[PDB]
Amino acid sequence: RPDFALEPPYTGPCKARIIRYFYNAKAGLAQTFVYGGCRAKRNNFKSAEDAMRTAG
């Protein structure tokens, strides 16, 4: 799988509380995290099925 899938979830500098999905390399499952609202990295998805398609 690509390099971004193994990278830790990035909240970013912004201060909003937006629930986004990422892929955990340790657990091997798609979990949720708090995204700040700006400067997203690639391991940041809007839906659970969009995370499973690209990363799984």
Binding site: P13, K15, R17, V34, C38
Partner: protein, 223 residues
Amino acid sequence: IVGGYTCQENSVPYQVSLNSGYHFCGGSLINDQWVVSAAHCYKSRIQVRLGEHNINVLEGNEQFVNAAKIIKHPNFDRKTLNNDIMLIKLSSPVKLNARVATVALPSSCAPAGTQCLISGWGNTLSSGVNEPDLLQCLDAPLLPQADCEASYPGKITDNMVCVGFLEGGKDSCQGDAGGPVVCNGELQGIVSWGYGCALPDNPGVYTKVCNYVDWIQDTIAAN
């Protein structure tokens, strides 16, 4: 808000919660039909919740109103966060009382050292996540522009201001964006960004509202 205290019930009547299924950002009521928030808090559909204290329990003093028009600043930059300001027109006028009130737009730019009040329902921890039910408050001063620039090299524009403590421990955090920074009864800042929350040498960065008074008034009159 990290290192703050629980605000006295309805002591911040201008504070609103932006909700699209859950609380995601704050905002401030400036007149009976308009709310001001941060541009990064943009969503196509937003419900504005006024008269709130406990975000998770219906108290009976709340007013739920949908957003009719959402207008971001035309010069907003998603990367640099310059011009992080947004206006929200409500679908219907709100009923103004002791629980729901407006905050005044700034008469001028407040100088460094002015004590302000920051509020929100954001994360209360610097490390970890703890989302409060009750509205949190924080008394913090406007920092000198030189100290803001020293903390964030080449990232601070003239449309930004640092509010907080250089030692850390007290700051706004995730869930507080769009929220108010009120100094002497006037809205001087909007919660925008920062590197982490409550970290030493990294105070919160806020949108300097005094540079936008004319844009706000002209947009309200035209829409």
